[PDB]
Design a binder for this molecule. Structure first.
Ligand SMILES: CCCCCCCCO[C@@H]1O[C@H](CO)[C@@H](O)[C@H](O)[C@H]1O
Length: 321
């Protein structure tokens, strides 16, 4: 049951891992390995400093639990979680294992010319995935082409949250102006820009800095403070803009790239949209199981949070095959 572990020096860090994980190679805390058992390419993350203090011990607990909970075909899943520790008394480090995908959306877009057929399929999957994360009270906030992975079968997974500027390009306006209580539809704005890049092959808002990213946005959607001082920009007609896009692609877009986060279509509404008629299937578009958050109101010592995390690691069961 317990694997043989081996040890290794990598970026001034000694990694200790089960012997199934071979060829460890860091990228930028995170190593790519080859899982000889499963013949699968994997990423292995070793956690930075769990149990650092009390607020981290607790954050490590909460987020491990959130991650264990993820089970959906369009969302990164946990293949494995382990520690070389042989007892709670010596438990310090925690390792996470997920599979490494092969391609992602940015390397794809920068190499091949997609048809509307390809686009409809990719976005459906992204939205189906987004429906699920949102339903689990999560707000991803860095949705970008490089963190949208696709494997051989063209199955796409959303990758990069509770885990780890090209991002500013896909960021919702309200996220750049330090709103404090922003909405889940910040993620739908991201989808809209990704979608626009799929339809055309080009970056919609390739802006350098904050205010300038924003000048570029105003130039598409027209002007809605330092804004009561910004130039008059009239609203562009999206059909005149996206020369080729299925007029259904354009209507969905018109509803994603809206400034008022209150009027922006949700993940669930967008799935029901006529652009997705061939894939839309309401009885296989599931939401997250309720999770218990009793611990959320507990006030324990660091070795209690560590005790609990330990027990989560130990109890983890991997995906069947
Ligand atoms: C220069 C334009 C910047 C963006 C304009 C408004 C962005 C989103 O809109 C606003 O965002 C808030 C948080 O999500 C909400 O509380 C507001 O009700 C909503 O209208």
């Amino acid at each position: 049951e317990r694997p043989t572990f081996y040890r290794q020096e990598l970026n001034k860090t000694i990694w200790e891992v089960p012997e199934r994980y071979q060829n460890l190679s860091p990228v930028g805390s995170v190593c790519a390995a080859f899982d000889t058992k499963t013949g699968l390419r994997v990423a292995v993350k070793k956690l930075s400093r769990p149990f650092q203090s009390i607020i981290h011990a607790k954050r490590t607990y909460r987020e491990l639990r959130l991650l264990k909970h993820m089970k959906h075909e369009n969302v990164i899943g946990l293949l494995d979680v382990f520690t070389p520790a042989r007892s709670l008394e010596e438990f310090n480090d925690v390792y996470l294992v997920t599979h490494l995908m092969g391609a992602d959306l940015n390397n794809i877009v920068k190499c091949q010319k997609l048809t509307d057929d390809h686009v409809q399929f990719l976005i459906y999957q992204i939205l189906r995935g987004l429906k699920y994360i949102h339903s689990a009270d999560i707000i991803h906030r860095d949705l970008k082409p490089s963190n949208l992975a696709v494997n051989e079968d063209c199955e796409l997974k959303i990758l990069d949250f509770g885990l780890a500027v090209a991002t500013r390009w896909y960021r919702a306006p309200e996220i750049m102006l330090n709103w404090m209580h922003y909405n889940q539809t910040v993620d739908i704005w991201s989808v809209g820009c990704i979608m626009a890049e799929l339809l055309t092959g080009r970056t919609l808002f390739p802006g350098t800095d904050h205010i300038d990213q924003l000048k570029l946005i105003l130039r598409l959607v027209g002007t809605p403070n330092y804004i009561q001082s910004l130039t008059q920009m009239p609203k562009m007609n999206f059909a005149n803009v996206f020369i080729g896009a299925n007029p259904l692609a354009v209507d969905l877009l018109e509803k994603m790239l809206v400034l008022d986060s209150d009027k922006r279509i949700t993940a669930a509404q967008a799935l029901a949209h006529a652009y997705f008629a061939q894939y839309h299937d309401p009885d296989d578009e599931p939401v997250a199981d309720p999770q218990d958050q009793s611990f959320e109101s507990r006030d324990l010592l660091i070795d209690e949070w560590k005790s609990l995390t330990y027990d989560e690691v130990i109890s983890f069961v991997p995906p069947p095959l």
